[PDB]
Write a protein that binds this ligand. Sequence first.
Ligand SMILES: C[S@@+](CC[C@H](N)C(=O)[O-])C[C@H]1O[C@@H](n2cnc3c(N)ncnc32)[C@H](O)[C@@H]1O
Ligand SMILES: [Ca+2]
Ligand SMILES: [Ca+2]
Lengths: 172, 1013
Amino acid sequence: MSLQLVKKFQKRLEDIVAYGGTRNESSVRAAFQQLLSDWAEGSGLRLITEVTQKAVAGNNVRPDGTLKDSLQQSRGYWESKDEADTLDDEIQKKLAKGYPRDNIIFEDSRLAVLMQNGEEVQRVDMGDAGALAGLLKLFFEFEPPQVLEFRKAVDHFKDEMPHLLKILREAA
Amino acid sequence: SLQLVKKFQKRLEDIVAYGGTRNESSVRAAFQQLLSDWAEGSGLRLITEVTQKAVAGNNVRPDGTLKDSLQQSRGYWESKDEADTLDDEIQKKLAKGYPRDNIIFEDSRLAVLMQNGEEVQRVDMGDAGALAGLLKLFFEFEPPQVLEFRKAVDHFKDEMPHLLKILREAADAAEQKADYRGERDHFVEIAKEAINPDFSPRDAREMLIQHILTGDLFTSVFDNAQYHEDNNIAQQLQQLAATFYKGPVKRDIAERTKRYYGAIQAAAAQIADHHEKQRFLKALYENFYRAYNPAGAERLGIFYTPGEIVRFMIEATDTLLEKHFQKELADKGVEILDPATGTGTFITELIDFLPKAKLEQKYREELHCNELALLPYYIANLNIEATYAQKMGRYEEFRNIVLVDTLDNTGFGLFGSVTAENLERAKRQNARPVRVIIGNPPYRANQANENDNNKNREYKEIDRRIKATYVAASTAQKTKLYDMYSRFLRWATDRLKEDGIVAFVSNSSFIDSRTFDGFRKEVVKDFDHIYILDMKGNANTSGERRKREGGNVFNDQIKVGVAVYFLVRSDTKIWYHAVPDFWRAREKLEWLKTTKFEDIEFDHIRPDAKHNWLGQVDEENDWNEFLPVADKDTKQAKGLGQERAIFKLYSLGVVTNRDEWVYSRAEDELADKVRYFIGRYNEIIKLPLGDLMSRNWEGDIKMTRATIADAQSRKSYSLEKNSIVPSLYRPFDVLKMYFSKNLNEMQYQMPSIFPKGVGENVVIALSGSPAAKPFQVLATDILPSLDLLEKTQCLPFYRYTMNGERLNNITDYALKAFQTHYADTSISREDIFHYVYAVLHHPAYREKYALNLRQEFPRIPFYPEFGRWAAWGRELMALHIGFESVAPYPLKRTDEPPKNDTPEALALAKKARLKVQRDAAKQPTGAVELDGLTTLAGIPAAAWAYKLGNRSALEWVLERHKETTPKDATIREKFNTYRFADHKERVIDLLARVTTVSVETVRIVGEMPAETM
DNA sequence: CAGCCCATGGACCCAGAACCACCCACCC
DNA sequence: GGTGGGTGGTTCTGGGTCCATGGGCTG
DNA sequence: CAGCCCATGGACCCAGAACCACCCACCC
DNA sequence: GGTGGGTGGTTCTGGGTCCATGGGCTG
Ligand SMILES: C[S@@+](CC[C@H](N)C(=O)[O-])C[C@H]1O[C@@H](n2cnc3c(N)ncnc32)[C@H](O)[C@@H]1O
Ligand SMILES: [Ca+2]
Ligand SMILES: [Ca+2]
């Protein structure tokens, strides 16, 4: 993942605008769609594209792609724009319509913004492989606080098993 | 790949499982990735959601469009929801104008391809093998642009003669400028020491026309104008062209030549794959020479190797490299050299085989090649450089191509000094350690006719080494081992200094030829494993053999036999596999595509004592039974010890080298052709000595080696009137002939058989060795030609010594041996003669000892009766000795008037046809259509079985009475007078008389024993 | 005589909106 | 089975600025 | 040594022959 | 309206020669 996959995306973005003669989002999205999809396959998640979600307002909204788990539970989202728009301006309108913000990569072909827990965690340039590979690591690993607390309780056992084994040995 | 299809099948399952939605928008990503990843390997890219204006002005946006590197749509895709009837939804989209050229409509479970507005295939996406097949079709669809490109390449070939007229005129007008003449003269001198000792102005102007032609096409259809500015050779030749080709002169020839270049340029610009545009390179190569210098094309061997053969050898070389040397073609160290590049096919197909990670090093220092002609050099350098560019992505100059004579650059020197860089490349190549010498060497045994004055060049060193190795070990009278293919094989053996493989495609003569017996002894001593694959195809054959040989693996464009051979040097194991008989060219070429070297079941060949690899006599006969003649019995002086054969002297029929000038049906007509010949000859011997020696005369007469030598010695000729004699040219064809030593190239020992042409001798003429036609024997009382029967060898009954008498040629050794086996002193010489004749007509003898007869003089058995056989041979003899004095078999004559009463229909209706009327089962009906008016009928089926060669006796009297057009210009326009109308009545009688002869001999031969001794 | 007043007309471009194509939810 | 709505693309259409910079004054 | 004999296999091409396409004439 | 010539083009397909020229004699 990381370098290998991101560098293939950089070449694919170039092949799309070269063999297609279009820098339109609807055509250039395939590059980041396949980055997010192939990274997910390795992390036990899948990027399912165009999945309609409902907002608090009741407005149905369809992000470009959602990161679904094995139990059909959304864990992250993605929206691509073209290079011919202001990413920051499209961001307020998107979230105003009722877009999710728990874990969303808003991305134009040149800049990528990760918004986690409602705040912009990182803003990288897609030209820098290592930088993008860093942001995508945080996106694919962001976990809800439920699993964050379970993981912490597993660590508690690693220092509680000795104390527990004493009782069982005393009983044996 | 099936792996790609199998991943789609999994991706689809996960999308409906991890996502929970079967909506088309969500499930389409599985096929989008399949199409996109397949395309990334095929040089195309699936661009998604690209809008296309439909024919009805409306805009349609398919889910995906396959696009080429020139941003040109090559295919389309529209996914639907499984919750619909695909068939119904296809119609809706197609009615809104969705493209129907190459579209994959696809619901999640079923896929439909509509190529050319018609459903080519409908598959289920649960089957991986089926989807992979449907996808292959879609990804390999031939768009209209590539078909139009192919069509225009075919028009360019026929319009090449007219383009070369404009370019010739330009170069002719250039010799009016002193600057061009100066540069031209410097170039000729430079290339008289770099390319060929006899480089002439003609060769220089060909090179200039080639430069200007290639220049235009390389900038317009191949978009590599820089090639010339980076090519060392191109920069030495642009010096010559810069004198005249500039400004108005160039603008004028360009406006005229644009009418030929226009169509090809238009179509080629819409083609991205160089593997499609390399078909134009092949066409320029083969057609330029055919239109400009057909003669130089023969000496260079301008032909292209079909891709299937090239690919096969590259794969089979890798196989034997791993088997005997534990190396691969991609491994560093294996330096591959193509001694004759041509279009560069072998090197460009190696680039496509070698892995990308290793290609860089190989292209830079391990792939090498040589060329002699300029058009081939330029075409190869561009082909090689552009094939590398397509595979790698970057353009690098191939600095391993040399314009040098491979058979002269044996300085391992001024060879290759056209430019300074070319000389470096030549000296560097002659030091490189070459492991593999792959290639298709030029083949040319001899010039076709002496009048061509286009003999093969002499290569002192190679020729001297061939003489010491191949020729010295050959027990043949005629050596054809100075063929250009044999010269390129000697060079290869010597170039491989240590170990390696020489993989070549060449004439299959080496396998079986009386002349290549020395090669078949020397090759086993310099190579350890020899793997021959005979693809047959020899069309210089006739009869059932021609049908067996089949088509030529070179797209049926050459007539010689072809064999792909691999000679490895690590006893000698000779392996041989032959392609099946009665096959076609496409069948043979598809076999090379499908079969891999491992699958071929080669047969171990064990050379015999005469080094014959194929066609070995069965050593379980009593074949050591007498001998009709032996080279020693003929060369012996006296003594029965050295006289061990039935006959002493034997000769071959007179060969003239000018058959059309010395043979005619009428005595008076011959005399006129012969008078013209002697007439123009006597004017040739008056020319200046310079012109005499340089063979600079108008070639209206046929001057053979002998006549050329006498002319240069100023020896006059005259017409001896008593030299026009009767001669049996072909079976049953008694044409008149001028038997003079001055106008007949080789009379052999026929002066001693038929003294002065008119003598009294009866000869049993047989076939020679090796007979490619069935064994034939005919008795003649008139001088036979060398080609009455294949390589006719005449055995005479008498022998006329000089100032002497007819000494009986049947030896006394034979007389006694026959009067001893049969214990009958009555047996005479004029009885053994007839006995031998009947034995040589015995059907079981000709069948059992066939292989023996094909390779040796026919040894004769000692049949029990003698009397019965001698009688048969007497009856047989008389039938052929007096075939003009037999009883004409009654043949019904039917006559018909011309279609109309116009003078011109009568003309087109007294012209000969002489065709045997056959059936739908191709069996003689028993009727011959002599001309358009007369048709003979009533011929028995038996008469169609006396076959002298591949033709019946009757088919011989029809063939040799047809009005064929003379192949000599003068004879055709001044001495062609034969009209079947004049001889019609004669051929009618001859047919009936020969019908009797044939029907008699089928009976006489049929009453002979069913078994042979 | 160098500051100090007095004109006077300028070789585009980009946000609203319409509307369109396509597919998904939504009635029907 | 349309229908409206979500999303992205593709035409039209409408509608309008501060400020350079030569010349005449002018005390 | 030049002046006789003796071989020996040869880098295609092209005339019918369908068999179409188109369409005038000929029945139907 | 088919239907067979008339005319021209467009593919296959079948089927096959005399004679160069080195080497070995030879006297
Ligand atoms: C059959 S073509 C090469 C074929 C090549 N395999 C191809 O696929 O195009 C024979 C070529 O050998 C070349 N050649 C190179 N060196 C030669 C030489 N010394 N003598 C004769 N031809 C030579 C000729 O110019 C001619 O183009
Ligand atoms: Ca988007
Ligand atoms: Ca679709």
